[PDB]
Design an enzyme around this catalytic site. Structure first.
Site, PDB file in Angstrom:
ATOM      1  N   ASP A 126      -3.255  41.458  54.586  1.00 52.02           N
ATOM      2  CA  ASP A 126      -4.250  42.071  55.229  1.00 52.02           C
ATOM      3  C   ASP A 126      -4.973  41.695  56.478  1.00 52.02           C
ATOM      4  O   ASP A 126      -4.865  40.494  56.642  1.00 52.02           O
ATOM      5  CB  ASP A 126      -5.267  42.631  54.086  1.00 52.02           C
ATOM      6  CG  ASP A 126      -6.178  41.600  53.736  1.00 52.02           C
ATOM      7  OD1 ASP A 126      -7.125  41.132  54.545  1.00 52.02           O
ATOM      8  OD2 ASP A 126      -6.022  41.305  52.469  1.00 52.02           O
ATOM      9  N   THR A 176      -8.492  54.851  46.626  1.00 46.70           N
ATOM     10  CA  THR A 176      -9.714  55.098  45.813  1.00 46.70           C
ATOM     11  C   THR A 176     -10.522  56.225  46.207  1.00 46.70           C
ATOM     12  O   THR A 176     -11.052  56.835  45.261  1.00 46.70           O
ATOM     13  CB  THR A 176     -10.491  53.739  45.749  1.00 46.70           C
ATOM     14  OG1 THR A 176      -9.818  52.418  45.154  1.00 46.70           O
ATOM     15  CG2 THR A 176     -11.839  53.536  45.150  1.00 46.70           C
ATOM     16  N   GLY A 188      -3.234  39.522  45.145  1.00 43.94           N
ATOM     17  CA  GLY A 188      -4.922  40.362  45.262  1.00 43.94           C
ATOM     18  C   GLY A 188      -5.384  40.835  44.080  1.00 43.94           C
ATOM     19  O   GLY A 188      -4.457  40.893  43.078  1.00 43.94           O
ATOM     20  N   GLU A 189      -6.456  41.221  44.058  1.00 40.99           N
ATOM     21  CA  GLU A 189      -7.183  41.798  43.050  1.00 40.99           C
ATOM     22  C   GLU A 189      -8.470  42.738  43.271  1.00 40.99           C
ATOM     23  O   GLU A 189      -8.785  42.715  44.229  1.00 40.99           O
ATOM     24  CB  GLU A 189      -7.759  40.676  42.053  1.00 40.99           C
ATOM     25  CG  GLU A 189      -8.933  39.857  42.890  1.00 40.99           C
ATOM     26  CD  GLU A 189      -9.568  38.786  41.991  1.00 40.99           C
ATOM     27  OE1 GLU A 189      -8.897  38.145  41.111  1.00 40.99           O
ATOM     28  OE2 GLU A 189     -10.711  38.947  42.030  1.00 40.99           O
ATOM     29  N   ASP A 198     -11.324  55.174  52.895  1.00 37.65           N
ATOM     30  CA  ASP A 198     -11.901  53.505  52.813  1.00 37.65           C
ATOM     31  C   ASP A 198     -11.168  52.798  53.514  1.00 37.65           C
ATOM     32  O   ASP A 198     -10.491  51.781  52.944  1.00 37.65           O
ATOM     33  CB  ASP A 198     -11.952  53.565  51.153  1.00 37.65           C
ATOM     34  CG  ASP A 198     -12.805  52.245  50.986  1.00 37.65           C
ATOM     35  OD1 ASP A 198     -13.870  52.006  51.751  1.00 37.65           O
ATOM     36  OD2 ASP A 198     -12.547  51.710  49.904  1.00 37.65           O
TER      37      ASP A 198
HETATM   38  C1  LIG Z   1      -3.272  53.263  42.482  1.00 38.80           C
HETATM   39  O1  LIG Z   1      -2.750  52.427  43.468  1.00 38.80           O
HETATM   40  C2  LIG Z   1      -2.733  53.095  44.723  1.00 38.80           C
HETATM   41  C3  LIG Z   1      -2.198  52.207  45.757  1.00 38.80           C
HETATM   42  O2  LIG Z   1      -2.943  51.248  46.094  1.00 38.80           O
HETATM   43  C4  LIG Z   1      -2.749  50.045  46.686  1.00 38.80           C
HETATM   44  C5  LIG Z   1      -1.158  49.658  46.837  1.00 38.80           C
HETATM   45  C6  LIG Z   1      -0.961  48.456  47.171  1.00 38.80           C
HETATM   46  C7  LIG Z   1      -1.855  47.585  47.350  1.00 38.80           C
HETATM   47  C8  LIG Z   1      -3.047  47.603  47.009  1.00 38.80           C
HETATM   48  C9  LIG Z   1      -3.512  48.949  46.548  1.00 38.80           C
HETATM   49  O3  LIG Z   1      -4.703  49.341  46.275  1.00 38.80           O
HETATM   50  C10 LIG Z   1      -5.821  48.361  46.343  1.00 38.80           C
HETATM   51  C11 LIG Z   1      -5.641  47.225  45.140  1.00 38.80           C
HETATM   52  O4  LIG Z   1      -5.029  47.505  44.200  1.00 38.80           O
HETATM   53  N1  LIG Z   1      -6.147  45.944  45.346  1.00 38.80           N
HETATM   54  C12 LIG Z   1      -6.003  44.990  44.473  1.00 38.80           C
HETATM   55  C13 LIG Z   1      -6.896  45.349  46.500  1.00 38.80           C
HETATM   56  C14 LIG Z   1      -5.633  45.019  47.767  1.00 38.80           C
HETATM   57  C15 LIG Z   1      -4.598  43.746  47.457  1.00 38.80           C
HETATM   58  N2  LIG Z   1      -3.694  43.791  48.242  1.00 38.80           N
HETATM   59  C16 LIG Z   1      -3.841  43.656  49.573  1.00 38.80           C
HETATM   60  C17 LIG Z   1      -2.553  42.996  47.838  1.00 38.80           C
HETATM   61  C18 LIG Z   1      -1.361  43.214  48.948  1.00 38.80           C
HETATM   62  C19 LIG Z   1      -0.925  42.237  49.704  1.00 38.80           C
HETATM   63  N3  LIG Z   1       0.397  42.726  50.107  1.00 38.80           N
HETATM   64  C20 LIG Z   1       0.659  43.884  49.663  1.00 38.80           C
HETATM   65  N4  LIG Z   1       1.853  44.645  49.603  1.00 38.80           N
HETATM   66  C21 LIG Z   1       1.761  45.551  49.209  1.00 38.80           C
HETATM   67  N5  LIG Z   1       0.750  46.035  48.408  1.00 38.80           N
HETATM   68  C22 LIG Z   1      -0.420  45.420  48.165  1.00 38.80           C
HETATM   69  C23 LIG Z   1      -0.434  44.470  48.821  1.00 38.80           C
HETATM   70  N6  LIG Z   1      -1.479  46.022  47.576  1.00 38.80           N
END
Ligand SMILES: COCCOc1ccc2cc1OCC(=O)N(C)CCCN(C)Cc1c[nH]c3ncnc(c13)N2
Length: 330
Positions: A143, A221, A23-24, A181
């Site tokens: 997601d 965010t 993801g990004e 959000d």
């Molecule tokens: C400062 O950070 C606070 C915590 O924010 C996050 C924690 C974990 C996340 C995503 C978080 O914020 C959004 C973000 O950074 N994106 C790049 C968008 C979403 C990407 N995902 C959906 C990728 C995803 C797929 N399986 C996952 N298993 C665990 N964590 C993930 C993901 N993403």
């Protein structure tokens, strides 16, 4: 603290070699890798530098800290007593790293770009003085948006709404939490062998039938919480663009939050959690498509109850109110 570490500290060779991008966004690349036979998610954010990344300035450490703090507080709910939930993404560690972007990560970045396509700059221009925050989270799955055509039935939909509702309620009660959000890209689904999931709200424990899925909330965010009267929140009172979106109910929720809080983002308005849950319920009924439709009496009934939730939930004041009082969860 103990100074920045090299990338090799968080991502030793074998863990780097197993990184796949998942993801990004503008302010974060996320990779899945494997440590001790277990998948984890690694989020990497460039910080403190003068120049543009993905079209925007890099956050400073002070600008990104609120989101790390919020991550940690919500993660810690899994180990609490009176208000306990595992429904937020578990945070394993946080490091500040210094160095150029590992060539092995670039390979992973390239593969994602070739297969899914990226909106981001190829991260090959960072110099050896570049600082990053590297966050390791439990792997949360995929997601909800990406699972649009992948869930079994509206019974699964009910579990997901119940899980989200319970998690937000526990966070309201412990931390005066608002997500702010919670669009369908920020709800993650992964398989679980547990038949029931457990939470505790103000000292009362209960369970939720999982339908084989565990939900994880992500992305802080815009989130808000507090401890001992110190409020951590994103002040969007002067943001223009956030409130002018169109084409999706998502963009109405930003406007409806602003209406509810009078543009005062420091205040606590747990109604915003109800607004997001309604938006998710709307997605369940309108944009999700299920492998098995409601072809029987019991299943047509779940459909009816979720339709009634959609019609009634905005008359509840908080995720707590919904969980404790709404007929859907009895
Ligand atoms: C400062 O950070 C606070 C915590 O924010 C996050 C924690 C974990 C996340 C995503 C978080 O914020 C959004 C973000 O950074 N994106 C790049 C968008 C979403 C990407 N995902 C959906 C990728 C995803 C797929 N399986 C996952 N298993 C665990 N964590 C993930 C993901 N993403």
């Amino acid at each position: 603290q103990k100074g920045p570490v090299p990338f090799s500290h968080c991502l030793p060779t074998e863990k780097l070699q197993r990184c796949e991008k998942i993801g990004e966004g503008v302010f974060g690349e996320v990779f899945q890798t494997i440590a001790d036979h277990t998948p984890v998610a690694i989020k990497i954010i460039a910080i403190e530098g003068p120049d543009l990344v993905n079209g925007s300035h890099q956050k400073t450490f002070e600008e990104i800290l609120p989101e790390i703090i919020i991550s940690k507080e919500l993660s810690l709910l899994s180990g609490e007593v009176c208000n306990r939930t595992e429904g937020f993404i578990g945070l394993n560690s946080v490091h500040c790293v210094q160095g150029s972007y590992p060539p092995l990560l670039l390979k992973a970045w390239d593969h994602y770009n070739s297969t899914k396509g990226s909106a981001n700059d190829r991260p090959d221009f960072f110099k050896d003085d570049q600082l990053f925050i590297v966050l390791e989270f439990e792997f949360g799955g995929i997601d909800l948006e990406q699972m649009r055509t992948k869930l079994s039935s509206l019974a699964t939909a009910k579990s997901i709404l119940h899980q989200l509702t319970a998690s937000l309620a526990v966070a309201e009660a412990s931390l005066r939490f608002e997500h702010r959000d919670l669009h369908w890209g920020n709800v993650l689904l992964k398989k679980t062998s547990l038949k029931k999931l457990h939470y505790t709200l103000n000292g009362k424990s209960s369970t939720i039938p999982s339908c084989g899925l565990q939900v994880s909330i992500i992305d802080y965010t815009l989130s808000r919480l507090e401890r001992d009267g110190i409020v951590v929140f994103c002040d969007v009172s002067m943001d223009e663009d956030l409130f002018t979106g169109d084409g999706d109910y998502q963009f109405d929720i930003y406007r409806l939050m602003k209406k509810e809080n009078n543009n005062r983002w420091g205040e606590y308005h747990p109604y915003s959690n109800v607004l997001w849950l309604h938006y998710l319920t709307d997605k369940m009924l309108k944009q999700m498509t299920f492998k098995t439709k409601c072809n029987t009496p019991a299943m047509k009934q779940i459909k009816r109850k979720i339709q009634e939730f959609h019609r009634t939930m905005l008359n509840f004041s908080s995720a707590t109110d919904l969980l404790c009082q709404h007929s859907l969860f009895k």
